[PDB]
């Protein structure tokens, strides 16, 4: 009564967006190490039971289309849905290869009124990106 | 009827306004921590227990090394946003 129903044929889809190289217009640098992260995440989320697909150097439009199209698939037989975003970021926004898109615009495709097959099911987003320019100096 | 915004979870690598750290040789701090916890406990622990332990490991195990002293010895805490209505186990 207090756990999500996991009795489905599939755990679910997991989309990994792995943005390493950015257009010169953006002025953002190469994200070395993000390939080791994607492979590690690929094996972990695979091992959890997800059907993982990695998409490399996406544009903002590809990112909105991948997530819009995933939203419109049929999840009747999936328990949940996961999306992992690895890219450059600023507050509330994520970098494509070409520019920024608001994180809210990627996730809104999965709201209860826009994806009935994930109603009452967890939708998980893991975001490795910057959210501003502040630094945490720490304290002993 | 149920709310349209229910049953999302956002696991961010860092808190709003802050940088997020990446080691080019070993990967980003958050992902190293996440995969390490998941490899050891992904099928035992509830998602909030998993992510809380990820929070702990990023907070304690990592401290930046940079040539720039303005970027030296900095720290990071990830940040979880939960609209979940139930406990989540991958089981």
């Amino acid at each position: 009564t207090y756990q999500y129903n996991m009795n489905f044929e599939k755990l679910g889809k997991c989309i990994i967006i792995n943005n390493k190289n950015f257009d010169k217009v953006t002025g953002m640098g190469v994200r070395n190490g993000t390939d080791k992260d994607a492979e590690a995440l690929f094996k972990c989320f695979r091992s959890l039971g997800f059907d993982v697909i990695v998409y490399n150097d996406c544009s903002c439009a590809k990112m909105q289309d991948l997530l819009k199209k995933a939203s419109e698939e049929d999840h009747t037989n999936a328990a949940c849905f996961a999306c992992i975003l690895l890219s450059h970021g600023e507050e509330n926004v994520i970098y494509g290869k070409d520019g920024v898109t608001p994180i809210k615009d990627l996730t809104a495709h999965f709201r209860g009124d826009r994806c009935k097959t994930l109603l009452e099911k967890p939708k998980l987003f893991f975001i490795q990106a910057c959210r501003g320019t502040e630094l945490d100096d720490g304290i002993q | 009827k149920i709310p349209v915004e229910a049953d999302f979870l956002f696991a961010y690598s860092t808190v709003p306004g802050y940088y997020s750290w990446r080691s080019p040789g070993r990967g980003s701090w958050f992902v190293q921590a996440l995969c390490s916890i998941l490899e050891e406990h992904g099928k035992d622990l509830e998602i909030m227990q998993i992510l809380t332990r990820v929070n702990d490991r990023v907070a304690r195990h990592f401290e930046s090394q940079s040539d720039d002293p303005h970027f030296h010895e900095k720290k990071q805490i990830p940040c979880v946003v939960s609209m979940l209505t139930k406990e989540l186990y991958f089981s």
Binding site: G27, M28, G29, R31, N32, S87, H88, G89, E90, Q128, A129, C130, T133 | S13, Y19, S20, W21, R22, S23, P24, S28, W29, S64, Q65, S66, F71
Partner: peptide
């Protein structure tokens, strides 16, 4: 280590 702009 590096960060994920210097605005």
């Amino acid at each position: 280590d590096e960060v994920x702009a210097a605005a």
